[PDB]
Amino acid sequence: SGFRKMAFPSGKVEGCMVQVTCGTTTLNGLWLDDVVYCPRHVICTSEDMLNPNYEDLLIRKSNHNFLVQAGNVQLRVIGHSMQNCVLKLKVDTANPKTPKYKFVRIQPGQTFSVLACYNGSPSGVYQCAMRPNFTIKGSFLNGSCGSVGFNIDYDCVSFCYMHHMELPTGVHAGTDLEGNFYGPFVDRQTAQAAGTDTTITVNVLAWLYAAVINGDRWFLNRFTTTLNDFNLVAMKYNYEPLTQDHVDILGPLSAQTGIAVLDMCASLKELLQNGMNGRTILGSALLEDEFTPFDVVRQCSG
Amino acid sequence: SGFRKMAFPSGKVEGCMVQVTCGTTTLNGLWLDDVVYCPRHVICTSEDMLNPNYEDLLIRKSNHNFLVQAGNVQLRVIGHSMQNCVLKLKVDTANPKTPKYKFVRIQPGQTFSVLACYNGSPSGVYQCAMRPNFTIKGSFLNGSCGSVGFNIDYDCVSFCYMHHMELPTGVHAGTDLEGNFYGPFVDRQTAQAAGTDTTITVNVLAWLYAAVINGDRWFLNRFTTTLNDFNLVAMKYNYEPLTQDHVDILGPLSAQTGIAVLDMCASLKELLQNGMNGRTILGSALLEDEFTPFDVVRQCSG
Numbered sequence: 001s002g003f004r005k006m007a008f009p010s011g012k013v014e015g016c017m018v019q020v021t022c023g024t025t026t027l028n029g030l031w032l033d034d035v036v037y038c039p040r041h042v043i044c045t046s047e048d049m050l051n052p053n054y055e056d057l058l059i060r061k062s063n064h065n066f067l068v069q070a071g072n073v074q075l076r077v078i079g080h081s082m083q084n085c086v087l088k089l090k091v092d093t094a095n096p097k098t099p100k101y102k103f104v105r106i107q108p109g110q111t112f113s114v115l116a117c118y119n120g121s122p123s124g125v126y127q128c129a130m131r132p133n134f135t136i137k138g139s140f141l142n143g144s145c146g147s148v149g150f151n152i153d154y155d156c157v158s159f160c161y162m163h164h165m166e167l168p169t170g171v172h173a174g175t176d177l178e179g180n181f182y183g184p185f186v187d188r189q190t191a192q193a194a195g196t197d198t199t200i201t202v203n204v205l206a207w208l209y210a211a212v213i214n215g216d217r218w219f220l221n222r223f224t225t226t227l228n229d230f231n232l233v234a235m236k237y238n239y240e241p242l243t244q245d246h247v248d249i250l251g252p253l254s255a256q257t258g259i260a261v262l263d264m265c266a267s268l269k270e271l272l273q274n275g276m277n278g279r280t281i282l283g284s285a286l287l288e289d290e291f292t293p294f295d296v297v298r299q300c301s302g
Numbered sequence: 303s304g305f306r307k308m309a310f311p312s313g314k315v316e317g318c319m320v321q322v323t324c325g326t327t328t329l330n331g332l333w334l335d336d337v338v339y340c341p342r343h344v345i346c347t348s349e350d351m352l353n354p355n356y357e358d359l360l361i362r363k364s365n366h367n368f369l370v371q372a373g374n375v376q377l378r379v380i381g382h383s384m385q386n387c388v389l390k391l392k393v394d395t396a397n398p399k400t401p402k403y404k405f406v407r408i409q410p411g412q413t414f415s416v417l418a419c420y421n422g423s424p425s426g427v428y429q430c431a432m433r434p435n436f437t438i439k440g441s442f443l444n445g446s447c448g449s450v451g452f453n454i455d456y457d458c459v460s461f462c463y464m465h466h467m468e469l470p471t472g473v474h475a476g477t478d479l480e481g482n483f484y485g486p487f488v489d490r491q492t493a494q495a496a497g498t499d500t501t502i503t504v505n506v507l508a509w510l511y512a513a514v515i516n517g518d519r520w521f522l523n524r525f526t527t528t529l530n531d532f533n534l535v536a537m538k539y540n541y542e543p544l545t546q547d548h549v550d551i552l553g554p555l556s557a558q559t560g561i562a563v564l565d566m567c568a569s570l571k572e573l574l575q576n577g578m579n580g581r582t583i584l585g586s587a588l589l590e591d592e593f594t595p596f597d598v599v600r601q602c603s604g
């Protein structure tokens with residue numbers, strides 16, 4: 001197909017990555033104005049990591065225990081606090097590369113760009129989606145803790161994810177920039193399982209709209225459905241139910257193609273019930289669920 | 303610990319993107335030190351684009367016919383020349399964000415990051431490969447002309463691609479930074495086909511090693527093959543030959559996984575002859591060929 005996982009240009013975020021070290025424990029942090037944000041796990045020694053008491057651990061730290069570096073350049077820490085699972089270190093220098101920014105908490109299905117970093121040095125950028133079980137299928141090595149995920153709209157970086165940990169199945173878990181985990185996970189080095197995942201229905205529908213835009217439309221039928229009936233069927237096939245917000249974000253694709261959202265729902269319901277019977281959509285037998293309606297419009301229309 | 307198409311961080315290149323305008327024709331340029339590089343197609347009017355005589359068109363221009371804009375700042379052009387299909391505009395100010403850089407010509411099968419840009423403004427970043435038929439399967443829209451492809455090694459940006467055009471099939475053609483096309487194409491608005499494409503065998507093997515590293519092993523078998531006998535089958539299926547150099551560069555991945563290169567070849571041979579019978583590898587329903595061995599080593603080990 002002519003669709004790629006495309007990331008946002010990463011330069012605005014690259015200019016904000018720093019390294020934070022407490023003793024020998026080291027990870028990545030995010031320097032915006034005169035504050036550095038990073039996972040509070042940095043304050044753990046190896047022996048603390050299993051079952052940390054973060055209040056007690058933080059109480060015994062002072063500003064002079066935190067080594068924050070921009071490249072090789074040390075930034076002096078002049079205050080510290082903890083908000084949920086994020087440490088906030090106030091530094092004596094406002095980052096001159098700070099972009100316009102927001103902190104946002106995203107829903108499952110939403111996509112974002114990840115800047116994978118090691119020792120405060122950006123290494124790679126890629127797009128990924130928040131799964132319905134609140135994990136991401138990222139690509140992260142040891143030392144990636146504190147890498148961030150983001151979108152860029154207008155000229156403003158919306159930070160939505162800070163990476164904390166790998167789960168036993170190789171998927172990834174983390175927090176928003178206010179330190180609240182996505183999903184039921186905790187920041188301790190214990191085995192935590194993600195729940196069973198489901199397919200992101202709103203994104204599958206966006207993919208079907210993308211196929212229509214490109215002239216691949218064999219799956220359009222003469223039926224419609226109600227949203228409630230569709231949701232009840234979807235859940236029988238391990239598909240997420242649609243929300244009212246999902247119907248709304250499909251609006252532009254519906255308008256562009258002239259296909260009502262609930263008619264697309266009826267078409268997807270036929271595919272769930274009957275399978276693709278050997279046919280392909282956009283050259284594939286698999287339905288893509290990590291392109292949002294906004295991703296589709298970006299790549300089709302710019 | 304996950305496998306994604308990962309691009310280089312784009313910030314070093316973002317700082318070099320400008321807009322170039324000649325008359326009403328406009329596209330993207332690359333500002334390094336005191337020179338702006340862009341496709342010479344920019345000197346064409348609408349009527350010229352169908353069948354341009356570029357040396358004629360260029361002698362009919364002066365420095366003041368070129369408008370170069372870097373954000374809200376106009377750069378004064380104080381000289382111009384052509385190098386093959388690349389226009390070089392000397393400006394009166396050096397770019398302070400110029401990275402350390404080189405111009406390189408890549409080989410089919412090699413990968414690079416693309417920074418897609420519109421009207422001099424970076425819009426997205428993604429990884430792609432130079433196809434054996436010297437096209438690229440990019441994500442590019444109208445106005446992307448002059449976007450660049452690059453790799454980053456240490457702190458040095460190696461520019462390898464400058465985007466020119468989309469072919470009727472929806473794939474893309476462009477030049478190196480010395481203005482030579484990859485492939486049999488010309489910078490004329492006329493329908494151009496590429497040669498028949500093949501699959502990049504060494505890259506498929508690298509990606510199968512990535513699959514094994516990430517625990518996806520169903521396709522392994524215990525057949526063995528010689529390099530020659532694998533190559534006879536590969537060529538039958540429109541796969542590129544595997545050379546001894548290819549075998550050598552897969553060595554690190556062979557060592558890591560304990561799977562001899564020719565044992566992986568025997569696995570690939572079976573996949574070509576039998577298909578993947580509805581199964582996936584690393585979530586893909588088809589054999590992926592846009593990851594090089596180095597790509598896999600970098601993403602799976604650092």
Ligand SMILES: CC(C)n1cc2cc(Nc3cc(=O)n(Cc4ncn(C)n4)c(=O)n3Cc3cc(F)c(F)cc3F)c(Cl)cc2n1
Pocket residue numbers: 024025026027039041042140141142143144145164165166186187188189190303
């Ligand atoms: C001795 C010094 C140098 N030192 C050791 C450290 C170990 C740490 N623990 C983690 C680091 C990390 O990068 N990741 C992310 C990840 N993504 C994919 N892979 C494979 N790894 C982790 O998951 N962890 C474990 C972990 C991190 C948490 F934030 C958490 F709440 C629980 C965890 F189990 C770290 Cl962070 C620093 C180290 N420094």
Ligand SMILES: CC(C)n1cc2cc(Nc3cc(=O)n(Cc4ncn(C)n4)c(=O)n3Cc3cc(F)c(F)cc3F)c(Cl)cc2n1
Pocket residue numbers: 326327328329341343344442443444445446447466467468488489490491492
């Ligand atoms: C403002 C007005 C006066 N104006 C119109 C222009 C048209 C131009 N022509 C192209 C622009 C472009 O971005 N792309 C790349 C691309 N990638 C995917 N898509 C769908 N399009 C093109 O392929 N072209 C066509 C094209 C470009 C060449 F460099 C070439 F040698 C032959 C071509 F047919 C341009 Cl470049 C500027 C324009 N300005």
